[PDB]
């Protein structure tokens, strides 16, 4: 019922003029093609190395719509497997996290080791007189798993490029958060999970290239939150320079500030901790990244984070018109317990199902998805013309394509990457098309 040929991906989006057709947000055939290609060939976030410290520790997560289990091995390596018994396809694990020595299927009793091999089969001599090859029937394994400074990503496809090459320039911005202090980072206190009724492209695009909405959507929160002396006005009011990076679908954005200051939504203790440890962060990275304590960042397809409040967000697609959000809080390992408690309170207050800020965003996305149900509604062009033609490469030492923070360079780049991945058979063709597009836009 779904055919790649009948679909016209390039017809729906027009990057050069900046027009988008809303039919891409509601089409089931598009959704199945996405599940086959985009989530099949792109690196996806799995977990943090702090969550599986000792051998035998495991964590249950998702890739696309497929359940996956991540397990720490005896020699220190990390592996990821699909949750499916090779006989009748029943899951072998259900807990959120823990420690185990083998996974046992409850339906019939097949047992698998942590390395994935099939160790036990009940009544094998009677059931299989001809003999069974236990080598062939091991657990399905993710071929590519790799960790960047403590964040574990995984890929289904061997032909795809490595993690470092897939990241590219956005690694320079992620290093700003991940490498502030010696010792790395760690997660603090559990995971928050909830469900929103909107396509997965809405939050991804917003966390890629949207600072425009914070002026109007979050006016009430600014007015209310704006006894210790602090700057009531938000950082964007007094900022001198602003930067947005929009390349390969990876997006980032921040403001230039004289002093290291977090946003008004954080607690005083968190800002004090940030100010006290400025010398080490400046020495390790540099003045430009050290002074950045506010911004937005998104890694294609579905990893999002903000610099100030220290939150990680992962979106799992559930059908063409739903998504599930998992939210983590991450902080420096060397921080004391009190500072970590302050971080947890601040992040859970500002962002979450009951946060001051998330409510309006989720409401807007759900309203748009509800509207997109009529024939006339999803055949009208939408404007994407912010900052068109002003793209340039900075010479001050900041890598990548750069434009003003009030522009849609990253959104257009993400949509171009989406159209290229959806309409190409091989990764080499995708890379060639991306290079051609970059050469066109830069000149």
């Amino acid at each position: 019922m779904t055919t790649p040929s009948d679909l016209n991906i390039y017809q729906l989006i027009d990057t050069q003029n900046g027009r988008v057709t809303p039919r891409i947000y509601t089409d089931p055939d598009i959704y199945q093609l996405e599940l086959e290609r985009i989530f099949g060939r792109c690196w996806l976030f799995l977990a943090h190395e702090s969550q599986i410290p000792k051998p035998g520790d495991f964590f249950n997560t998702y890739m696309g719509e497929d359940a996956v289990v991540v397990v720490r091995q005896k020699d220190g390596s990390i592996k990821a497997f699909l949750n499916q018994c090779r006989h009748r396809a029943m899951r072998v694990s259900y807990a959120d996290c823990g420690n185990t020595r083998a996974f046992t299927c409850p339906y019939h009793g097949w047992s698998y080791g942590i390395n994935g091999e099939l160790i036990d089969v009940p009544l094998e001599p009677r059931a299989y007189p001809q003999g069974l090859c236990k080598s062939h029937w091991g657990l399905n394994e993710v071929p590519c798993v790799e960790s960047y400074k403590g964040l574990i990503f995984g890929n289904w496809d061997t032909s795809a490029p490595g993690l470092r090459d897939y990241l590219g320039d956005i690694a320079w911005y992620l290093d700003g958060m991940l490498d502030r202090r010696e010792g790395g980072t760690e997660i603090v206190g559990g995971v928050q999970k909830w469900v929103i009724n909107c396509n997965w492209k809405f939050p991804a695009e917003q966390f890629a290239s949207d600072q425009y909405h914070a002026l109007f959507s979050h006016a009430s929160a600014v007015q209310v939150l704006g006894g210790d002396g602090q700057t009531a006005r938000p950082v964007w009011e007094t900022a001198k320079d602003a930067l947005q990076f929009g390349q390969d679908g990876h997006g980032s954005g921040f403001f230039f500030t004289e002093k290291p200051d977090a946003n008004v939504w954080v607690d005083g203790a968190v800002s004090s901790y940030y100010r006290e440890t400025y010398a080490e962060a400046e020495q390790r990275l540099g003045e430009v990244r050290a002074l950045r304590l506010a911004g937005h960042n998104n890694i294609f397809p579905t990893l999002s984070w903000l610099n100030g409040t220290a939150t990680l967000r992962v979106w799992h697609p559930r059908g063409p018109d739903q998504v599930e959000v998992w939210a983590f809080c991450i902080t420096d390992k060397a921080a004391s317990d009190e500072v970590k408690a302050a971080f947890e309170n601040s992040a859970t207050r500002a962002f979450g199902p009951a946060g001051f800020l998330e409510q309006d965003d989720s409401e807007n996305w759900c309203e748009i998805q509800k509207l997109l149900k009529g024939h006339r509604a999803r055949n009208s062009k939408l404007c994407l013309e912010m900052g068109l033609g002003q793209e340039k490469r900075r010479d001050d030492g900041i890598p990548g394509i750069t434009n003003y923070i009030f522009s849609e360079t990253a959104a257009r780049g993400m949509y171009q990457r989406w159209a290229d991945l959806l309409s190409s058979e091989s990764w080499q063709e995708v890379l060639d098309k991306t290079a051609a597009y970059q050469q066109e836009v830069m000149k």
Binding site: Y94, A95, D96, C97, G98, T100, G189, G190, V191, Q192, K193, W194, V195, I196, N197, S217, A219, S220, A221, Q223, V224, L225, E324, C329, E344, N345, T348, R349, G352, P353, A354, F356, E358, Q359, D360, S362, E363, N364, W365, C366
Partner: protein, 172 residues
């Protein structure tokens, strides 16, 4: 276990809780704020699934907050709605609180009583939106010399491991 109060105290405390719920249902947030005591603690946490061995031992996967408030943060949450620029609550939600299974017991501190109830919160908003939240609730109540009651604490339990609503803009 815990000593049960007599009939009169049970009646009065139950009526106080019903009055507070009715104030919440009628969009009177200033009176509801007047009901609370200065040391109010408003709490909710997350829910997890554990292994059989962990349950036998008593260990659980780590959890995190959802609500953690004092009176001042509740004042801020009220003022945010009163500004007129909260798009989550424009138009406002329509809610009903149903309270049942009220158990009241005495406490070591004089003039403080512990309460446990079960609740169903029904929320309908805009057109064709409906949501049920079912759970349990623990409270502590203080009586003044003028026969007026104040709420000192509230700890809420929600039975959903994966919350199925896009946001929680209602006060439980």
């Amino acid at each position: 276990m815990s000593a049960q109060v007599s009939l009169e105290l049970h009646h009065r405390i139950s009526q106080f809780l019903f009055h507070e719920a009715s104030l919440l249902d009628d969009w009177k947030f200033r009176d509801w704020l007047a009901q609370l005591d200065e040391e109010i603690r408003y709490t909710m946490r997350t829910t997890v699934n554990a292994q059989t061995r962990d349950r036998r031992k008593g260990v659980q996967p780590p959890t995190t907050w959802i609500f953690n408030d004092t009176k001042d943060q509740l004042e801020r949450r009220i003022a945010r709605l009163e500004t007129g620029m909260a798009w989550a609550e424009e138009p406002p939600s329509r809610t009903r609180h149903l309270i049942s299974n009220c158990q009241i017991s005495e406490t070591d501190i004089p003039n403080v009583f512990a309460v446990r109830v079960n609740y169903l919160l029904y929320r309908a908003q805009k057109e064709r939106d409906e949501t049920f939240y079912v759970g349990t609730r623990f409270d502590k109540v203080r009586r003044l010399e003028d026969d007026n009651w104040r709420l000192l604490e509230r700890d809420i339990v929600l039975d959903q491991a994966v919350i199925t609503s896009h946001n929680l803009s209602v006060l439980f």
